[PDB]
Amino acid sequence: SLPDITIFPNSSLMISQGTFVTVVCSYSDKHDLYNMVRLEKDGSTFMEKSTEPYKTEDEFEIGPVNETITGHYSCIYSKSERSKTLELKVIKENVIQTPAP
């Protein structure tokens, strides 16, 4: 294998303007009991859908992203339980070349 690196805290992500973000909600022990899943953003429902019948993960994709996507997110499963919260900040930064002296 290869070595790995993990950094803490890792609940606040920087996201490039224009990219597509993938959110993977998961409820591996109890998925069978819930028929709806929603992505909550800043206290409101951002997206919602029926739970997947064939696996315990549910994906939401958002893009091309802009500054309206900046915010706090959590997955909520319902028939009601929430995940931890993650923060996203969408930024537009250019590739910058520093000249040699």
From Swiss-Prot:
Q: How does it assemble?
A: Interacts with SH2 domains of tyrosine-protein phosphatases PTPN6 and PTPN11. The interaction with PTPN6 is constitutive. Interacts with the SH2 domain of CSK. Binds with high affinity to extracellular matrix collagens, the interaction is functionally important.
Tissue expression pattern? Expressed in lymphoid organs and in cell lines of hemopoietic origin.
Q: What is known of its domains?
A: ITIM (immunoreceptor tyrosine-based inhibitor motif) motif is a cytoplasmic motif present in 2 copies in the intracellular part of LAIR1. When phosphorylated, ITIM motif can bind the SH2 domain of several SH2-containing phosphatases, leading to down-regulation of cell activation.
Q: Where in the cell is it found?
A: Cell membrane
What ranges are annotated Extracellular (topological domains)? 1-101
Q: Which residues are glycosylated?
A: 10, 66
Q: What does UniProt say on post-translational modification here?
A: May be phosphorylated by LCK.
Q: What job does the chain carry out? A: Functions as an inhibitory receptor that plays a constitutive negative regulatory role on cytolytic function of natural killer (NK) cells, B-cells and T-cells. Activation by Tyr phosphorylation results in recruitment and activation of the phosphatases PTPN6 and PTPN11. It also reduces the increase of intracellular calcium evoked by B-cell receptor ligation. May also play its inhibitory role independently of SH2-containing phosphatases. Modulates cytokine production in CD4+ T-cells, down-regulating IL2 and IFNG production while inducing secretion of transforming growth factor beta.
Disulfide cysteine pairs (residue numbers): 25-75
Protein name listed in UniProt: Leukocyte-associated immunoglobulin-like receptor 1
User: Which positions fall inside the Ig-like C2-type domain?
Assistant: 3-87
- Lineage top rank: taxon: Eukaryota
